[PDB]
From a paper:
The first step of this pathway is carried out by a [name] ([name]) belonging to the fold type I aminotransferases within the pyridoxal phosphate (PLP)-dependent superfamily. The structure of each LiTAT subunit shows the typical fold type I of the aminotransferases, with each monomer having two domains. However, unlike other aminotransferases, Leishmania [name] is not able to transaminate dicarboxylic substrates and its preferred substrate is pyruvate.
The N-terminal domain was too disordered to be modelled in full-length LiTAT, but its deletion in LiTAT_truncated did not affect the overall structure of the protein. Indeed, the best resolution (2.35 Å) was achieved for the LiTAT_truncated PLP-bound structure. However, residues from both subunits participate in the stabilization of PMP and their disposition is similar between LiTAT and TcTAT, although Thr184 and Tyr345 in TcTAT are replaced by Ile221 and Phe378 in LiTAT.
Author numbering:
A (entry chain B): 40 to 61, 73 to 362, 368 to 381, 394 to 403, 406 to 439
B (entry chain A): 40 to 61, 64 to 448
The structure:
């Protein structure tokens, strides 16, 4: 015979509730489903050129190709309204990752040990909770106030901070809330992080996907010595999540977080980096994508916002991202044939996440069915 | 002011000795000749098949494969890989034991290694790993607080596993036996009989066998590759492989793992690996479809070209044996590397493989890798995949270098 082989504690406690939960589907967080949103043609053709050259099939540096890091550094400068802020973004502090999902893993596991906690918004993109449970880090939720435009309850969060608290995480613009934070509110967050002396992690992957001529405020656009780790990429706004490319950018002017940066660098060695074809294709086109491409998608999202309004169930209208928030029992009865998502999944019972990114013809039929 | 932010223990102990090596610039006027590089794309002499390249083109232009794949891999590629590995099995039953349900698509074999070990072991466990070895097993183990417990390969018995010594290393915390076959850095290609013995060893000790078979297509001299798949056994085996080396595209970051477990004693291991793919959420969707379209269509001819190039590189290293300069070596039967054994008693001022590496580089601007990096001092890893003109020139400098330091 042969002794049964069991798995590790690490594997056993690694759970993704969304995926575990798994016809008109308003539950899907992937902009490629219908084809109404499209990757820019120049990116598609840069990929064609790059793979046909045969010059980008070799090993990249595990931290990312130099030129893509440089380009990403240059690209994020546009979110900075000032020269000093812009100069504070250095390519040396850019890391290319296998999607933002990996950037989250690297950020959290280079920073925390088992037994630590981080403060994370609720409701939230579930990956932070999943990564935390996987590695024995506590995901300590602070709550977002839906009646104050889904702003962070900074009064409450203060009471959650202790000696094992290692970071403060925000998602802005937000999946699942569709929120877009004001400049003053982002300033408060930074001050909060200063008062409590913890780094700020800002998931800014929807940066290009603000609606209604809204203003996006990146944690980069401030004069502060508070270390900030910005996570972003092209997966959502260039409609190519399956390419598995994203990045993290550290802004640390007084250099208080250098070991974190080194730790993240060292940990890229484990899977040894990112698809070399996509890295070069994005390095060639990231700065050349015209406002019009981002402007077509934003208009397409504004349409979905209009369709959900007919239901008015209450809701805070979306200012950004691809979702609106409007609980488990309601979800189950709808399928028995429309698919929504319960906010339970995201850390806040009593809501439903619905997607804005599908065609009106699909949405209208589903909103009517609701 | 602001509290200094420090890193985790996991980060602090994560080290890759190869990268770290990257070395004093040479005080020489000769051209830099690098024999240290483990990337088949370096010179352009070896080539990704055109049919794979044009499948990538069709796939990306379609705009139908830019979405999220399943974290475990696209269904069609998993089915295709399963079908592909069947050719390494000589029988219907062995072929039937390969199931696409037990294939996982990974971000290179490097991720496959992470998933295999961290889904199996807890901190405080150990695994048996060959030395010398591709450094990633050691790097991942140390990163995760798993002990990399070396058993030694024998350069005089064709770089075979010393199984007798390995037996004394097994204890209650030993969780796996790792082999690399064909081998980086040794160039060895195991006989069927040795692979049979390795499996028997794993049966006696009741530990799973992990086999890095990424050089499966790159056997030389009409050799026979024996996959751990090609056996009638209930020993659980996890095979790591991919297209990175033999289709000359390591940078695309695609590889896979295949679990073969006929009595289903390792289902939890499989479920664990699957769960852990959720953390980076999978693999480049363009390449998975491109490879799904072409993996079964690539002609034998594309590979025999690469093999021919490697056999020629091997002949050039053989020239080192014609001079009495203290270099012995088992000619490579596979993979892309050779291990040069140093007779240190030949040299007046060369104490170690490391010192040999430094002085060679400083004096002749030829870069090899000391075997220390791979877990076995007293050797040098040299690459066979470069063009003959590069190798021939570099071997001349090595010969000259040895004669000069002798006595
Ligand atoms: Cl990782
Ligand atoms: Cl991973």
């Amino acid at each position: 015979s042969f002794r049964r082989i069991a798995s590790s504690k690490h594997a056993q406690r690694t759970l993704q509730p969304l995926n575990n939960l798994t016809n008109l589907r308003l539950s899907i967080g992937d902009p490629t489903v219908d084809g109404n949103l499209k990757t820019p043609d120049i990116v598609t053709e840069a990929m064609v050129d790059v793979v046909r050259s045969g010059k980008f099939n070799g090993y990249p540096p595990t931290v990312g190709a130099d030129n893509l890091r440089q380009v990403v550094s240059t690209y994020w400068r546009r979110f900075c309204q000032t020269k000093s802020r812009q100069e504070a973004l250095k390519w040396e502090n850019v890391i290319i990752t296998s999607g933002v999902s990996q950037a989250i893993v690297l950020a959290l596991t280079a920073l925390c040990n088992e037994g630590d906690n981080i403060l994370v918004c609720a409701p939230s993109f579930p990956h932070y909770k999943s990564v935390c449970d996987s590695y024995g880090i506590e995901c300590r939720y602070y709550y977002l106030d839906p009646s104050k435009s889904w702003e962070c309850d900074l009064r409450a969060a203060a009471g959650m901070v202790d000696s094992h608290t290692k970071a403060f995480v925000i998602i802005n613009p937000s999946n699942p809330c569709g929120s877009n934070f004001s400049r003053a509110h982002v300033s408060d967050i930074i001050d909060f992080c200063q008062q409590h002396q913890i780094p700020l992690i800002s998931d800014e992957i929807y940066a290009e996907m603000v609606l209604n001529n809204g203003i996006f405020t990146s944690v980069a656009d401030f004069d502060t010595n508070v270390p900030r780790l910005i996570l972003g990429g092209t997966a959502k706004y260039q409609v190519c999540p399956g390419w598995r490319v994203g990045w993290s950018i550290l802004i640390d002017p007084m250099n208080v977080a250098g070991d974190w940066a080194v730790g993240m660098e060292r940990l890229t060695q484990l899977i040894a980096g990112v698809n070399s074809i996509c890295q070069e294709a994005i390095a060639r086109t990231l700065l050349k994508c015209p406002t019009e491409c981002t402007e077509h998608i934003v208009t397409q999202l504004e349409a979905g916002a209009k369709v959900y309004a007919r239901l008015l169930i209450s809701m805070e209208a979306p200012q950004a991202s691809m979702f609106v928030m409007l609980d488990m029992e309601f979800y189950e009865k709808l399928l028995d044939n429309v698919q929504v998502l319960p906010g339970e999944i995201f850390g806040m019972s009593g809501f439903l996440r619905a997607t804005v990114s599908r065609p009106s013809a699909v949405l209208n039929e589903a909103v009517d069915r609701i």
